[PDB]
């Protein structure tokens, strides 16, 4: 990518953020007309500024910006909860078409701390025919978007069943996730009762079932 | 102000060649352009070529100017300002680094100092250039512990996403739902949420349906009592 | 561009030839041109030639009590209201055909020629009594 | 904020409706054929020279079923037939008994 | 947007069109509503069929004045043997009409059910024959010849018909006042493209199959449909109010 | 103030809003709106609006030739006579209806249109010879 990031910025509630970028004469931002978009990684995208600080029809005008002989930036003012994704932008001139950037993933602290509602969903009748070893759970509104991989298997920490997954943003401007496991059913049945580890910052009352009943 | 739709849901072989669609509604078919774009693997997308289904004058980017052209049709004007038009692209070669997300936007405007830019995204389409084959998902039920949030269970699946999964779509008010897992074998799977007040099980249905297409849907299991 | 070229295209390009639609409709249809002359074309011909002029007229009485007695564009100085559109200054210029834009107004489009004469006109006529002589 | 409005003379709008009408036709018969039914003894001249401009980008409904150019032709010749007969011979007397037989078939 | 029309000539005819105008094409199908069998249908010829009506009568001008100076033209005896009135169709080239409009209504009509095509079913002598003013005299030529094949599913001979003339007229049913049409001395030819067709309802058919369209032209305006379905006129406004960053001067 | 609403009203009051006088008589009478069409209704109607454009054009027609195309209120450079009238400069204006004003000067209105033309457009327009382009 010939186009710069202002990378990981952070802000908080009420106030504003600025991601600037700069690039190379050939493709620089001294004379060449910019432009700045939304992108939920995985959902939608989404427009913000046209051509220099002229805003979108419909985009709240606190989205400010300038442009000067190499720097070129996005002033986000008066943030709200839900301003928490990944921005772009890229160059173009009249004729051409758009040169994207890189990534500034955007996150917004200053929120509150929230508890997420975590229940554990065992495997059940139909995963024993299949004899596939298996067990899930389930995490929603646990900001801050950090992760704790961790089980009890013999009440200790298993070595080959953890499966670390994605974590995603939810739709509600929160963040889910959930973890698998991938396992022999000896290994199962060798090992009866199990324990759910979610190292979550807080008091220790985390919830834990029982696979053979 | 118009809403435009990509086909979605294509994948072949790396070595193979296929084309995306995308329907457009709202929005006169004849002035605004299009274009498209595409994410990597890598963190940043990339743009493409915009299209100018007047005329016909198009600069695509250098580096798939060789082997990615792109046509579209004329349009069925529905009044004298809303129409409906659809828009072609074709691909020749790809490989693993082509693999990812594929969107179609609307032109921004139609004048001078800018209209090259995207305006109006769609839902978007995915491809996977993965060389391994497609295989069917396999169903489960995924009950509750605490019965003495629900959801059902999806094990093993190739590629892609398996999209809407709840029976007669019964409930689309208050059903959290949740995204997809690598497996350390590198089959998928999932999981969703559904956010609906404890009732008793005699009263209530727990039926779910999952769509798909790397083979085809049929059966809706429900969950185990216990 | 010979006549309303500019129809279907943008108001800003329909903006830069204006002239030409304004020259050809007051004096277009070649209206200049047994004993009797009581005949049905006569009588249709007279009538469409009256209206010809007192729809003309009709127009041309309205850019008079507005500064506007000899000029195709006049600025005037009446502030523009929120509730009339909401959209920016490239973005209607830039994507609506003068089409689109008669019906968007046509609901408070009486409103507007009313405010219209008493800034540009009403008062401003009025403002050289201090501003004439002294 | 702080824009202003601003009046534009001759700009490119319409309206559906209909009004009056008028014949267009070049020198056809004049001398050695007259006094025409349809285009009367005299009626506005055509220029040789066709009016026509294409339109681009303009996608106006029409309807033909519910178009009033049609009414306002079947009303026009209408009017002009009855105006081509007031002025001939009118024949009243020869409503009499008709005394009759067949022709002359052998 | 045209300021004049083309050029338009009023042909008073009945359930046939002649000297229409088209432009390429399939032979085209309007309907002011295609599912109501019981509105007529304008349909138009990719190509027009050439045509000849004529009288073989050879009639003589018999003036006899009636009052101070008008005078009663009538005919006189026929000279040179009576003949009957009739009109030539090209036999030939009305099999590859009636096979091109057929197949236009098939993806139209279906495209499944019989076609029935009859002579004009009631109506009256001059609403079901096609009834026009040529030469001078009032034709009516008997259209009952031409509709009578079929076609579903996958120098020369020139069919004729009939044809008888009229002298009393009072068109489009006007009742006011009639007029009697003087009879044109000598040979009378008239030599007509024709253009277009008039077709109207096949019964109340209860769903099945089995339906087409045979001849009616009950109205005269909708014989001028057939040169004015592209036009529309509209009413131009010239004013139009537009915002922009822009005042004149402040005192004036 | 709807139509003539300060027609009692002092001459400069009804200087106040002359526009509303204006604008309702050229537009004004809803002109716009068996077989035939020749009634006595018909040809009332067409003369009655062949007059309503012909006065209006007989009045528009002095104001061109005097500088006012498009202005509602001109001051003209043509001196005031004193023989016109004898009355100070807040004598007639907070006293007399234009209506007793109109028989005041109908007796020396011709004579005031004939100086009208000579001095603000007869002579105006032919000062700029010397100083169009020099
Ligand atoms: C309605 O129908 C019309 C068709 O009507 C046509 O009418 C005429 C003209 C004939 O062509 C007929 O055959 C047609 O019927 C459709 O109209 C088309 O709309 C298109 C989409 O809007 C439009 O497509 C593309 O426009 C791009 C942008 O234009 C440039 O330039 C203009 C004018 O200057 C400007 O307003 C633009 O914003 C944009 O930016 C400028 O670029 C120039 C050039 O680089 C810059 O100039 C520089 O200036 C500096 C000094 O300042 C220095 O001198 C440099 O050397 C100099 O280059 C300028 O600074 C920029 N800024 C400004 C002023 O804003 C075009 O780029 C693109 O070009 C392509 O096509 C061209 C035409 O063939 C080619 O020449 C070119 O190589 C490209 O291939 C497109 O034109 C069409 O132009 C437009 N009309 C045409 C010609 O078809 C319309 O779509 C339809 N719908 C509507 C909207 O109603
Ligand atoms: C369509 O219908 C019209 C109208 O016909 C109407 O009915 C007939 C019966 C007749 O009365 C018409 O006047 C009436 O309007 C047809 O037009 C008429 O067709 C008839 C057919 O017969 C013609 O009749 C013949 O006329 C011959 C000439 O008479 C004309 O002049 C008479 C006076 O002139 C006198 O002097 C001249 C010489 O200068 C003599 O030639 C003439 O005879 C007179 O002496 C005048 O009164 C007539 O109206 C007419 O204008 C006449 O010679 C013929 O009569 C002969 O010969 C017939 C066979 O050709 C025969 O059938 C008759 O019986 C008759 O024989 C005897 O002839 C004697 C001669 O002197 C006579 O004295 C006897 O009395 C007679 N025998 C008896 C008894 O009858 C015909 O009468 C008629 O001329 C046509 N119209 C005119 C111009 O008047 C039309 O043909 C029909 N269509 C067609 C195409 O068929
Ligand atoms: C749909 O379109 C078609 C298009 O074809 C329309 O069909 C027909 O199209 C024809 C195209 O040629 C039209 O033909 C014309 O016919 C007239 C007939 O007028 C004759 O009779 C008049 C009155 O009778 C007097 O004279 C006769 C002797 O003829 C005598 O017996 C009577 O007692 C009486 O005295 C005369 O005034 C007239 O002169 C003529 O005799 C004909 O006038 C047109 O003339 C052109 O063609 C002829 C023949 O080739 C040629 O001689 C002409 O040359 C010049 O010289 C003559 C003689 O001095 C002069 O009259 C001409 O003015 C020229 O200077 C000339 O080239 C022509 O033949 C036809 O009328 C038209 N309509 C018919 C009947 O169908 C069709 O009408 C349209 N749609 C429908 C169905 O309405
Ligand atoms: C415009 O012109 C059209 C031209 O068609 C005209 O239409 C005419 O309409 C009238 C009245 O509606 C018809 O009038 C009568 O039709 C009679 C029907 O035929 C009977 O007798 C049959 C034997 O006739 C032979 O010819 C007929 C054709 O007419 C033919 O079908 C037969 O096969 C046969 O060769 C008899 O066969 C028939 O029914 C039996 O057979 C049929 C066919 O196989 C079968 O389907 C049945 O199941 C049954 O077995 C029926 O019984 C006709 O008889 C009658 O007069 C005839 O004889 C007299 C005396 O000799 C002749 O002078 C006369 O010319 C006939 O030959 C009479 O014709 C008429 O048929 C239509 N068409 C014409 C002219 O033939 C329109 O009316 C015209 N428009 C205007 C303005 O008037
Ligand atoms: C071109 O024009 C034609 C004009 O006909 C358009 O054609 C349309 O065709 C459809 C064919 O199905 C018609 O549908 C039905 O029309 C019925 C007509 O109503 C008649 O009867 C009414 C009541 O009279 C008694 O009999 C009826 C029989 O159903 C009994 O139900 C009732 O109890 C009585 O005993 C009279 O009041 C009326 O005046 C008529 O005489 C409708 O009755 C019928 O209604 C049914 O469907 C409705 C719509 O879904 C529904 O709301 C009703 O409850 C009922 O189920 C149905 O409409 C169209 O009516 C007919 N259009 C018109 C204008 O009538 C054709 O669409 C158009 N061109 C196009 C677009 O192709
Ligand atoms: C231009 O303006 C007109 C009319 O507005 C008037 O004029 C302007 C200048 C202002 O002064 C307004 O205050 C005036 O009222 C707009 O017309 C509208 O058209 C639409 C579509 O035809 C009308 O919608 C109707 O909806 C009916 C159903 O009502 C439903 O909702 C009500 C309210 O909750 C509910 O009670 C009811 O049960 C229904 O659920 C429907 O039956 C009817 O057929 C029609 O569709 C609307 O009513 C009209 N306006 C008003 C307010 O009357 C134009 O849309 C506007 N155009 C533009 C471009 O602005
Ligand atoms: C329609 O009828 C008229 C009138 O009968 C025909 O006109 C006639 O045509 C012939 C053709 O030769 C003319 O020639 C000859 O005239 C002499 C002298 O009159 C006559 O003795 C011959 O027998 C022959 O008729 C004739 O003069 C002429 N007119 C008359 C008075 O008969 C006409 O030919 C017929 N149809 C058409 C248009 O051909
Ligand atoms: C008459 O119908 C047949 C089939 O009913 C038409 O053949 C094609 O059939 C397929 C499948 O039913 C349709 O998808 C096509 O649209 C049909 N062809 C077209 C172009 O319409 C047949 O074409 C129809 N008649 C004709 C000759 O048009
Ligand atoms: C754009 O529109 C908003 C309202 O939607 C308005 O507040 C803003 O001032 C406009 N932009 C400009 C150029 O003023
Ligand atoms: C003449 O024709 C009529 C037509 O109805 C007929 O009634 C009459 O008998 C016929 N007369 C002769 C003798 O031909
Ligand atoms: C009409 O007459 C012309 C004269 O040349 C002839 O060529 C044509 O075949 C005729 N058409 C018919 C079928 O009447």
């Known amino acids: 990518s010939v186009l710069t990031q202002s990378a990981s910025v952070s802000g908080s509630l009420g106030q504003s953020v600025t991601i600037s970028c700069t690039g190379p004469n050939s493709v620089c931002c001294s004379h060449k007309s910019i432009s700045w978009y939304q992108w939920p990684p995985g959902r939608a995208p989404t427009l913000i500024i046209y051509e220099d600080n002229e805003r979108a029809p419909g985009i709240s005008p606190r989205f400010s910006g300038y442009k000067s002989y190499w720097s070129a930036y996005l002033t986000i003012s008066d943030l709200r909860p839900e301003d928490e994704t990944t921005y772009y932008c890229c160059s173009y001139t009249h004729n051409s078409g758009c040169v994207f950037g890189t990534g500034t993933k955007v996150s917004v602290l200053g929120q509150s701390k929230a508890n997420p509602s975590v229940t554990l969903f065992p495997p059940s009748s139909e995963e024993l025919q299949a004899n596939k070893a298996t067990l899930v759970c389930l995490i929603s509104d646990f900001y801050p978007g950090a992760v704790t991989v961790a089980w009890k298997a013999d009440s200790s920490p298993v070595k080959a069943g953890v499966e670390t997954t994605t974590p995603s943003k939810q739709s509600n401007n929160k963040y889910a996730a959930s973890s698998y496991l991938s396992l022999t059913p000896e290994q199962w049945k060798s090992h009866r009762s199990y324990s759910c580890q979610v190292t979550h910052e807080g008091s220790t009352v985390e919830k834990t079932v029982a696979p053979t009943e | 102000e118009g809403q435009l739709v990509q086909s979605g849901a294509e994948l072949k072989k790396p070595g193979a060649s296929v084309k995306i669609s995308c329907k457009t509604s709202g929005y006169r078919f004849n002035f605004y352009h299009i274009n498209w774009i595409r994410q990597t693997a890598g963190r940043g997308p990339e743009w493409m070529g915009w299209?100018?289904?007047?005329?016909?004058?198009?600069?695509?980017?250098?580096?798939?100017?060789?082997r990615v052209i792109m046509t579209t049709d004329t349009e069925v004007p529905v009044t004298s300002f809303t129409s409906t038009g659809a828009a072609y692209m074709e691909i020749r070669n790809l490989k693993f680094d082509d693999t990812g997300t594929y969107f179609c936007?609307?032109?921004?405007?139609?004048?001078?100092?800018?209209?090259?830019?995207?305006?109006?995204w769609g839902q978007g389409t995915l491809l996977t250039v993965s060389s391994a084959s497609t295989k069917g998902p396999s169903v489960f039920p995924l009950a509750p512990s605490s019965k003495s949030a629900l959801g059902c269970l999806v094990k093993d699946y190739f590629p892609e996403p398996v999209t809407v999964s709840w029976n007669s779509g019964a409930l689309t008010s208050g059903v959290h739902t949740f995204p997809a897992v690598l497996q350390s074998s590198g089959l998928y799977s999932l999981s969703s949420v559904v956010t609906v007040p404890s009732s008793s099980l005699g009263t209530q249905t727990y039926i779910c349906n999952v769509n798909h297409k790397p083979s085809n849907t049929k059966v809706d299991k429900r969950v185990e009592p216990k | 561009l010979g006549f309303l070229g500019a129809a279907g295209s943008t108001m800003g390009a329909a903006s830069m030839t204006l002239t030409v639609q304004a020259r050809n409709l007051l004096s277009g249809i070649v209206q200049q041109q047994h004993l009797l002359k009581l005949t049905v074309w006569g009588i249709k011909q007279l009538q469409a030639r009256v209206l010809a002029v007192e729809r003309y007229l009709r127009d041309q009485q309205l850019l008079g009590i507005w500064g506007c007695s000899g000029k195709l564009i006049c600025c005037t100085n009446v502030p523009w209201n929120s509730s009339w559109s909401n959209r920016n200054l490239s973005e209607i210029w830039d994507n609506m055909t003068w089409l689109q834009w008669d019906k968007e107004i046509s609901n408070y489009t009486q409103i507007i020629y009313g405010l219209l004469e008493e800034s540009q006109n009403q008062q401003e006529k009025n403002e050289q009594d201090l501003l004439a002589l002294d | 904020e702080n824009l202003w409005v601003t009046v534009y003379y001759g700009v490119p709008v319409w309206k559906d409706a209909e009004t009056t009408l008028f014949c267009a036709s070049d020198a056809k018969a004049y001398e050695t054929e007259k006094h025409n039914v349809w285009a009367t003894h005299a009626c506005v001249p055509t220029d040789p020279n066709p009016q026509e401009i294409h339109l681009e980008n303009v996608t106006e409904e029409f309807n033909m079923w519910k178009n009033n150019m049609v009414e306002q032709m079947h009303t026009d010749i209408i009017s002009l037939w009855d105006q081509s007969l007031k002025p001939c011979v009118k024949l009243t007397p020869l409503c009499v008994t008709l005394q009759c037989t067949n022709v002359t078939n052998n | 947007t045209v300021q004049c029309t083309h050029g338009i000539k009023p042909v008073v005819s009945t359930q046939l069109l002649l000297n229409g105008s088209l432009a390429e094409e399939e032979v085209m199908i309007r309907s002011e509503n295609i599912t109501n069998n019981a509105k007529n249908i304008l349909v138009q010829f990719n190509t027009p069929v050439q045509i000849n009506c004529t009288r073989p009568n050879n009639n003589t001008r018999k003036s006899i004045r009636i009052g101070p100076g008008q005078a009663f033209y009538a005919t006189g005896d026929i000279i040179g043997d009576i003949r009957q009135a009739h009109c030539n169709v090209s036999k030939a080239t009305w099999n590859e009409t009636l096979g091109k409009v057929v197949k236009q209504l098939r993806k139209h009509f279906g495209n499944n059910t019989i076609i029935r095509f009859a002579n004009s079913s009631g109506g009256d002598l001059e609403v079901t024959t096609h009834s026009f003013n040529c030469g001078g005299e009032f034709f009516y030529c008997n259209t009952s010849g031409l509709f009578n094949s079929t076609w579903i599913s996958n120098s020369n001979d020139s069919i004729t018909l009939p044809c008888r003339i009229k002298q009393i007229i009072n068109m489009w049913q006007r009742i006011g006042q009639a007029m009697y049409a003087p009879p044109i001395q000598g040979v009378i030819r008239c030599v007509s493209n024709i253009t277009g067709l008039i077709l109207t309802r096949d019964g109340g058919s209860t769903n099945s199959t089995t339906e087409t369209f045979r001849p009616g032209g009950g109205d005269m305006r909708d014989n001028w449909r057939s040169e004015l379905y592209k036009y529309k006129v509209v009413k131009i406004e010239p004013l139009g109010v537009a915002p922009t960053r822009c005042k004149r001067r402040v005192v004036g | 103030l709807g139509f003539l609403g300060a027609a009692g009203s002092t001459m400069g009051a009804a200087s106040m809003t002359l526009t509303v006088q204006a604008r309702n008589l050229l537009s004004g009478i809803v002109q716009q709106q068996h077989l035939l069409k020749l009634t006595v209704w018909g040809i009332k109607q067409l003369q009655a609006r062949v007059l309503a454009v012909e006065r209006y054009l007989r009045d528009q027609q002095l104001l061109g030739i005097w500088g006012c195309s498009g202005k509602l209120i001109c001051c003209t450079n043509v001196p005031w006579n004193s023989s016109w009238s004898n009355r100070n400069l807040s004598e007639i204006w907070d006293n007399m209806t234009w209506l007793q004003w109109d028989k005041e000067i109908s007796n020396y209105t011709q004579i005031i249109y004939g100086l009208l033309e000579e001095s603000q457009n007869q002579q105006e327009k032919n000062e700029q010879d010397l100083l169009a382009l020099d």
């Open positions: 299209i100018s289904p007047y005329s016909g004058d198009k600069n695509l980017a250098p580096a798939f100017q060789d």
């Open positions: 936007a609307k032109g921004l405007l139609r004048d001078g100092s800018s209209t090259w830019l995207p305006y109006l």
